[PDB]
């Protein structure tokens, strides 16, 4: 029977992979085909593959191939027979796109840190990779599965202080490892705990192995066989920060998972310096690493389904980098994801004064006061454009000759409906970044006032700058939020009337708002200002900058505002508004 | 055991070198990372680009003149251009490098290379036997890249700035991010050779409205000799645009493979803010082992050339915005100057020595970058002011008062102690109060890192500045909103003199400000470390000699790190400041100081 050539280390995506098979599709996900024929682990792998969105039929359509031959354990693999089968696969094509899954790439006479089968061009997802046997953009490093993750369910113990500092629970280590661990234990004592040969036996003391790891803040993972140990998954599950002392070992999913925030890698020469290395790490970093290790276990190390999905996702990002998921989404726990901001306007650029701001003015059944404010607004320098949105559909716009004489190109937008959320629509006529939203009732603003507001906005392009000031307080008797404006010792919102903000915020309001706030506001004809403040605070994660030493900007309201605030807090799951006690006024 | 490690070291000492085999960690063995530059022989030509590289290394903080102390070596010989047809090629280099006393088979040598290979079948022809040396080559193929040994560096011209910055072209962050064109390219095409297959097939995808790609075969003698049946039309269409107007008016810029995988168009694309769409197969992008290029560019296989425009159109709008901003951040962080490139290479090498003291995948790919974030201070992101939004952490609620003393000082200590946010007070002589003995009247020693400072925020305050407790609380509350800046009362500005072409300093009734003085200022403790372990000894020594200008350098450093102005809050000696500012601008290469007309006040 034919046998392929040995694994080629000079085999990358741009040479071995065939991108013609999976060119482009709307849902940018690769297609995986499975050969019809096995260990229960490999069965769970194939079931996970078949029950995902990467599984397809009509072999001519699929881009990746996963043969149904058990390769996970190489101790009883019968290399030659597996090679004959892979050659016989009838669609091998020199293994151009075939994906192989393995977790123990070790041979009893010698450990090659890679699959010993020919696998000329086959792509490997192996549990143990050295930096010499791992192809960078071609291969995937995967965890080695431990049955304990399904056999025992450890309690979700939170981060905190623990009895032991450095723990080493492994079986059959090389004598030098044992000698140096014993030296560390005898040097320090009562903190370093080494366990001898699912039960751990210390001198005249017994522990349960999966649960003893819960009592240590650092756990040692050594290189004894295959360069990849199943103890790593147990260490991550128990929450203790792993300490990997393998010399040349590439951790699982290192392409996308940032292990610098979840583990400590110490070269095995400096083993006597391990304790001094770990003592330098402060408590907060230890807690963060415990959290990250637990998240890594619960997301990728938990079951074979997680491993298969992560491997296919990594390959998919390799095939379609433009649609790849973010490394932040990859390593952040759900709690961090909820807490994280990820500001989209993160680039710190200060726009030049040569540009301007397109003032958008909203009126309905008010013409004699719209004119009085458009006249004053038009005086402001660096006002590139002025848009007036006409809400009242029954009434007609005034005559063009009746409009004032201004220095800027005016335009009038004919609304299809009468909704107060139409002022936040991203207009293609807006050629600037800053957008000045001003209301007809707002009159006590000078040209210097607006110019200073715009100048302040230029220093904070990514947040909300507004003249009026409102905030929210918490009452114990109603156990809810209230809308407070009578007094001001702090601020958390500025009304959209007389406010400067980026047009990206208009885009967010129109499209990326959750599906409840926009329709609720279009129903209630109120609380657009509060919704915009909530959205800005949630997306940018920053406070709001008031710009006036002034409060009076005009010549069942409050209950409705409180209801709006409570509803907006409920739909976001929290209260994104941040209270600040500072205002910006000119020097 | 150790036998296995020795066997691995011996066996893999070749093309497959890594750090655990082809390196010696014993020479660094400390936080002090030092690089030694071989002295000039004064007998060979020196290219301007390699001269800039060596000046960046020499003027850096990793430079040492003692070969025993260093654990990284850089040759002074010209290695950037290894093409035999180039006018910068150095002959007899193979025998010349073996005559060096400190070569030691190039065990700990870093070699910079930008061009390799000759006219037929361009390859990695460095000429001399590199041995164990890791090369910071520009155009590296994927199958010829050592995953964690070599460094892929950008390819830059001889006119690339050495210390200064070009600031980028994205002045307006306009929405929609789309521009007049969708995908552009304007470069030569080669009739015969290697690397012209992708350039010859651009006329299929050329559209003329959104995807406009222009090529010419006029590249020498073949301008009329072997021209095919398309050179005439291609050249007539080519002479219609400018390659600069069409670069700043395009959302995406195509960067295909030429003769070599790397190209001059990459840095131009990053400067122009247009998202680069790379087509060269098997290219290790600059700092690919350190920078996530999926967040700053588009990577597409040139085998799937025809359907690229559909894929580029399918890219969502917010993704385009994120890519466009990431491009500018990368340009201003790691590619704006030769100094930034060289220091990026050295810092990437340094991160491989101590794996427990290094930068995570988030520091590099986020503001302000790895050059201003030194992991020796702390590998924990919460100890830096820049990473609170990315995490779920609020800024510290406690600060440390530091008073540099050379009476109001007694009243000042009492007033500051009454603050609810004050944990400890440190008094410098040249709530628990701490007094630290001083050995010299070095007034820049007030910025040193101290083990007694527990809080992240540090209030630096001179003895002659009387500050009320309520003012301290208000300033700290303001700083909690902007943890990355300097928040203080006394502010001074800067100006440009046309009469003398020298920067100027004002301190009276200015219309704006660009510096806030450290006499009544609040800032993160990390800037104490960055002031000491990042700024060169020359500037700080000049500060000590003149007995002023330490706070001006403080503001310079903070503005350079944050690219944002300080925030003022309220409610013969003079001639030295101008020279100080001019020297600081000369070292930095530009003026990080930014004017600001805002002033925060309590409500
Ligand atoms: C910005 O707004 C988003 C919502 O659009 C916030 O994300 C939401 O955060 C809350 C917690 O603050 C999450 O609630 C959680 O739900 C899980 C069940 O899925 C529950 O077990 C937890 O106890 C908690 O109640 C909510 O799921 C989450 N929603 C989404 C879509 O992510 C985000 O936190 C806001 N960010 C800021 C800075 O305000």
From Swiss-Prot, chain A:
Enzyme class: transferase
Residues annotated as binding UDP-N-acetyl-alpha-D-glucosamine: 366, 391, 418, 423, 439-441, 528-529, 561
Impact when changing residue 178 to A: No effect on N-acetylglucosaminyl-proteoglycan 4-beta-glucuronosyltransferase activity
Documented effect of changing residue 229 to A: No effect on N-acetylglucosaminyl-proteoglycan 4-beta-glucuronosyltransferase activity. No effect on glucuronosyl-N-acetylglucosaminyl-proteoglycan 4-alpha-N-acetylglucosaminyltransferase activity
Any one Gene Ontology molecular-function term assigned to this protein's record: protein heterodimerization activity
Residues the record lists as binding a protein: 483, 485, 552, 554
BP-aspect Gene Ontology terms: cellular response to fibroblast growth factor stimulus; chondrocyte differentiation; endochondral bone morphogenesis; fluid transport; gene expression; glycosaminoglycan biosynthetic process; heart contraction; heparan sulfate proteoglycan biosynthetic process
Membrane topology, record value: Single-pass type II membrane protein
UniProt GO cellular component terms: catalytic complex; endoplasmic reticulum; extracellular exosome; Golgi apparatus; Golgi membrane; membrane; UDP-N-acetylglucosamine transferase complex
Cofactor(s) it depends on: Mn(2+)
Record function comment: Glycosyltransferase forming with EXT1 the heterodimeric heparan sulfate polymerase which catalyzes the elongation of the heparan sulfate glycan backbone. Glycan backbone extension consists in the alternating transfer of (1->4)-beta-D-GlcA and (1->4)-alpha-D-GlcNAc residues from their respective UDP-sugar donors.
Family indicated by similarity: Belongs to the glycosyltransferase 47 family.
UniProt name for this protein: Exostosin-2
Swiss-Prot record, chain B:
GO MF term list: acetylglucosaminyltransferase activity; glucuronosyl-N-acetylglucosaminyl-proteoglycan 4-alpha-N-acetylglucosaminyltransferase activity; glucuronosyltransferase activity; heparan sulfate N-acetylglucosaminyltransferase activity; metal ion binding; N-acetylglucosaminyl-proteoglycan 4-beta-glucuronosyltransferase activity; protein heterodimerization activity; protein homodimerization activity
Mutagenesis or variant effect for residue 464 to N: Decreased glucuronosyl-N-acetylglucosaminyl-proteoglycan 4-alpha-N-acetylglucosaminyltransferase activity
Glycosylation sites: 8, 249
Protein's name in the database: Exostosin-1
Effect the entry attributes to changing residue 464 to A: Decreased N-acetylglucosaminyl-proteoglycan 4-beta-glucuronosyltransferase activity. No effect on glucuronosyl-N-acetylglucosaminyl-proteoglycan 4-alpha-N-acetylglucosaminyltransferase activity
Source organism per UniProt: Homo sapiens (Human)
Residues bound to UDP: 186, 188, 190, 199, 238, 243, 265, 268
PTM annotation, UniProt: N-glycosylated.
GO biological process: antigen processing and presentation; axon guidance; basement membrane organization; blood vessel remodeling; BMP signaling pathway; bone resorption; canonical Wnt signaling pathway; cartilage development involved in endochondral bone morphogenesis
Disease involvement: Hereditary multiple exostoses 1: EXT is a genetically heterogeneous bone disorder caused by genes segregating on human chromosomes 8, 11, and 19 and designated EXT1, EXT2 and EXT3 respectively. EXT is a dominantly inherited skeletal disorder primarily affecting endochondral bone during growth. The disease is characterized by formation of numerous cartilage-capped, benign bone tumors (osteocartilaginous exostoses or osteochondromas) that are often accompanied by skeletal deformities and short stature.
Record keywords: Disease variant, Disulfide bond, Endoplasmic reticulum, Glycoprotein, Glycosyltransferase, Golgi apparatus, Hereditary multiple exostoses, Manganese, Membrane, Metal-binding, Signal-anchor, Transferase, Transmembrane, Transmembrane helix, Tumor suppressor
Function: Glycosyltransferase forming with EXT2 the heterodimeric heparan sulfate polymerase which catalyzes the elongation of the heparan sulfate glycan backbone. Glycan backbone extension consists in the alternating transfer of (1->4)-beta-D-GlcA and (1->4)-alpha-D-GlcNAc residues from their respective UDP-sugar donors.
Pathway terms, separated by semicolons: Protein modification; protein glycosylation
Annotated catalysed reactions: 3-O-{alpha-D-GlcNAc-[(1->4)-beta-D-GlcA-(1->4)-alpha-D-GlcNAc](n)-(1->4)-beta-D-GlcA-(1->3)-beta-D-Gal-(1->3)-beta-D-Gal-(1->4)-beta-D-Xyl}-L-seryl-[protein] + UDP-alpha-D-glucuronate = 3-O-{[(1->4)-beta-D-GlcA-(1->4)-alpha-D-GlcNAc](n+1)-(1->4)-beta-D-GlcA-(1->3)-beta-D-Gal-(1->3)-beta-D-Gal-(1->4)-beta-D-Xyl}-L-seryl-[protein] + UDP + H(+)
